[PDB]
């Protein structure tokens, strides 16, 4: 009794959703799309390489101008690169050498970093004195930060190892809203184009769609078998892709509330570190532990190409807003731009 | 190349100059990862959300790290050594300690990292086996056939170090080895032991690259 009645109700609810999800699976996305011409072979070549990092690169984020990017490394350095001229714009020292995330504000006036210090640090770049000074040191998370994304110059969402996500007011320095419901460590975080929702991928082999204003979970997605390391919304905003350690990408639909396709091959055993889509969403780019990246056809689950230029783990991967270039950062302390 | 971007190129050169000069400064320091449990007493090893302690022995830099299941352990892929602290007095939690040591020894990211292992609070073990109120043969039945290769204390000490060494020698193919030690609260020659152990760790890698041993 007591907890037994609640446990039985939870089990019945889970079975109902499974039946409800099955009632909408009239036709597989693979079946529908087996009439379109394949994209063929994608021949992307290393155009510009970025040197200067001495330790492993753990994160990288593009700018909204599609020219400046910021990268974080274990050497306690944040570097802002002018990708067109390979020039170094800034070299921000870090109080902690342990960083796992890096964010670049949409306005370009701020950058964010975090890691094992359990702190999101926000650096103001467009100041007087011609230097870069820390403007906010967000504290309150009891676990390591995995990912942080800027909403605007005043709001930021952080993913931590305390199985929770938070929304911060930078000026006040407080947690406006906390997000609870994950069982394992939350590893990834992607913002929707309309900014009103975001998805989080955690070590519980599940993904959750959250409402920023409401603060409550709306949809939970469970189709994986291992930890989820990467996540990324479809450009439309009605779908997202997740990468796991089981060597498998899956595309989930928000409205259908279930998986659509799986991206897997028998010769891939290594886990997935980072995923992102292209400008039109036709190409899904995933980084792996086997020193290279794969380009998937998002509608037919076919390997369109391979990005093989790194001799260590590809940790971070990003696609510009205009879709011109793709940036890959690896554990070999190198950043490569592909076109 | 215009006037401003030529000046921007010169700024990048100075940034590169500072990047390489302080990278050399960090190249001369040795990074250590401190691991243990609540009762291990790992804070009071070297008298000197992540806590960093620094100590220098014979003019070499040591930079210790303290964090506090382990998804971040891949960040410590290139540390000089791992320092593991175990409370030998607590017989009940020893089985937990061996399970943690086995987990940390066979980690996919630490297959080539040596471990310096400290049996902290060796005095509490001395004034517990002699009393005889608690017997370590209860939790591990095989202390029954005890032999030393007070004896009751020496065999008790050697049995515990053998339990940890057996896990270390089970796998690894000799790439990384353990350095058992016995310590106490009043002991002060601890940074020296890490100094001697870290010297052997570096020497062995130099020997391997010379294809000598």
């Amino acid at each position: 009794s007591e907890l037994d009645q609640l446990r039985q109700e939870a089990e019945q609810l889970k079975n109902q959703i499974r039946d409800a999800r099955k009632a909408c699976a009239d036709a597989t996305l693979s079946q529908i799309t087996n009439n379109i011409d394949p994209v063929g072979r994608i021949q992307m070549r290393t155009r510009r390489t970025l040197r200067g990092h001495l330790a492993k690169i753990y994160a990288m984020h593009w700018g909204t101008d599609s020219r400046l990017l910021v990268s974080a490394s274990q050497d306690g350095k944040l570097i802002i690169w002018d990708s067109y001229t390979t020039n170094k714009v800034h070299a921000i020292p870090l109080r902690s050498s342990w960083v796992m995330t890096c964010a670049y504000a949409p306005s370009g006036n701020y950058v964010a970093c975090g890691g094992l210090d359990n702190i999101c640090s926000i650096y103001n770049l467009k100041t007087r004195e011609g230097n870069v000074r820390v403007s906010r040191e967000l504290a309150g998370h009891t676990g390591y930060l995995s990912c942080c994304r800027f909403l605007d110059d005043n709001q930021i969402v952080t993913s931590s190892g305390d199985t929770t996500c938070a929304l911060w007011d930078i000026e006040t320095g407080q947690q406006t809203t906390t997000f609870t419901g994950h069982t394992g460590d939350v590893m990834s975080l992607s913002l929707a184009p309309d900014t009103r929702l975001f998805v989080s991928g955690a070590c519980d082999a599940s993904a959750k769609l959250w409402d920023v204003r409401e603060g409550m979970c709306r949809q939970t997605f469970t189709g994986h078998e291992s930890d989820i390391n990467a996540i990324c919304f479809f450009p439309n905003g009605n779908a997202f892709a997740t990468g796991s350690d089981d060597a498998t990408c899956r595309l989930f639909d928000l409205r259908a509330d279930q998986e659509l396709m799986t991206y897997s091959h028998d010769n891939i055993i290594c886990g997935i570190t980072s995923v992102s889509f292209s400008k039109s969403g036709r190409l899904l780019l995933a980084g792996y532990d086997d020193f290279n990246c794969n380009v998937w056809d998002a509608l037919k689950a076919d390997r369109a190409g391979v990005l093989a230029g790194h001799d260590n783990r590809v940790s971070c991967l990003g696609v510009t807003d205009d879709g011109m270039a793709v940036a890959t950062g690896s554990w070999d302390s190198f950043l490569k731009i592909w076109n | 190349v215009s006037a401003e971007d030529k000046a921007a190129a010169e700024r990048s050169k100075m940034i590169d100059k500072n990047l390489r000069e302080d990278g050399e400064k960090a190249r001369r320091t040795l990074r250590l990862l401190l691991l243990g449990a609540d009762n291990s007493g790992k804070s009071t090893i070297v008298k000197q959300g992540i806590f960093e302690t620094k100590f220098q022995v014979d003019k070499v830099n040591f930079h210790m790290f303290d964090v506090g299941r382990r998804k971040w352990i891949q960040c410590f892929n290139d540390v000089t050594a791992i320092i593991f602290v175990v409370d030998s007095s607590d017989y009940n939690r020893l089985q937990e300690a061996l399970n943690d040591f086995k987990s940390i020894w066979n980690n996919r990211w630490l297959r080539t990292i040596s471990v310096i292992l400290f049996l902290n609070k060796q005095d509490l073990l001395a004034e517990k086996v002699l009393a005889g109120k608690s017997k370590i043969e209860d939790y591990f039945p095989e202390f029954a056939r005890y032999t030393t290769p007070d004896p009751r204390v020496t065999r008790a000490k050697y049995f515990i170090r053998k339990e940890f060494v057996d896990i270390s020698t089970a796998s690894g193919d000799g790439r990384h080895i353990c350095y058992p030690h016995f310590t106490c609260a009043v002991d002060t020659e601890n940074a020296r032991r890490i100094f001697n152990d870290c010297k052997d760790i570096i020497l062995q890698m130099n020997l391997r690259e010379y294809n000598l041993v």
Epitope: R67, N87, R128, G130 | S2, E4, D5, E10, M14
Partner: single-chain antibody, 233 residues
Framework: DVQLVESGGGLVQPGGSRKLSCSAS????????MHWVRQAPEKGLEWVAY????????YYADTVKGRFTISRDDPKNTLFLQMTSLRSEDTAMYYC??????????????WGQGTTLTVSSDIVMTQATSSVPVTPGESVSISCRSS???????????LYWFLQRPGQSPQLLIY???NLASGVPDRFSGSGSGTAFTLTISRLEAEDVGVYYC?????????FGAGTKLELK
């Protein structure tokens, strides 16, 4: 907070030597390239010398080359200008200008008070207007032309605008023909193409009067316009 305080100057006999010094206190002096700009007794604005951050690049105007020396003391947060064999043509107010150079930077942002010194293949930028009658609340357009196209092959056009109110050092308004300087009201705007540039001021008010100066940064020697004065009615 940011301040550039000048020192030196005075009455110097022709053929003498002098050493002007400007002290910087309030910003990262080491990371800033620095310029010297004079302004004749009652004439225009002329560039003199430049020293890069780290003292790795030094440029001089042809007038002062071989008899002017510019240096900086990073620990002392000061820069100097050692003048030798100075003549009557060197009598001017010597402004000291800070400048930084990266992508999206704002060079020539801060100017210091000048030093009054009294001695007893170039791009020509033409500001045809020299004085325009202006009524408050009206819209004012100032035109500028250059002998060479400032639009570079990288998409950046290197033209700058400055305002010098009476009794004050010039202040940056527009950098690269389109970007408002920090602290400049939104009523200022700039547009144009190579060889043809225009500064538009909407809803002109008080403290918006003075001399407006053009400048190129496409090629050293950096050169100014004559200057267009705005006066009341």
């Amino acid at each position: 907070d940011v301040q550039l305080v000048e020192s030196g100057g005075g009455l110097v006999q022709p053929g003498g030597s002098r050493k002007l010094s400007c002290s910087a206190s309030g910003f990262a002096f080491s990371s800033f390239g620095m310029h010297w700009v004079r302004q004749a007794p009652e004439k225009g604005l002329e560039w003199v010398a430049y020293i890069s951050s780290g003292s790795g690049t030094i440029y001089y105007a042809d007038t002062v080359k071989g008899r002017f020396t510019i240096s900086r003391d990073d620990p002392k947060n000061t820069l100097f200008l050692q003048m030798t064999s100075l003549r009557s043509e060197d009598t001017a107010m010597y402004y000291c200008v800070r400048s930084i150079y990266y992508y999206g930077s704002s060079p020539f942002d801060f100017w210091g008070q000048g030093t009054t010194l009294t001695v007893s293949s170039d791009i020509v930028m033409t500001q045809a207007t020299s004085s325009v009658p202006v009524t408050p609340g009206e819209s004012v357009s100032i035109s500028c032309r250059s002998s060479k196209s400032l639009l570079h092959s990288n998409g950046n056009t290197y033209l700058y605008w400055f305002l010098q109110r009476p009794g004050q050092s010039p202040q940056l308004l527009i950098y690269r023909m389109s970007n408002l300087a920090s602290g400049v009201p939104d009523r200022f705007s700039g547009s144009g193409s190579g060889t043809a540039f225009t500064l538009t001021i909407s809803r002109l008010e008080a403290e918006d009067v003075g001399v407006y100066y053009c400048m190129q940064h496409l090629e050293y020697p950096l050169t100014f316009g004559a200057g267009t004065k705005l006066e009341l009615k």
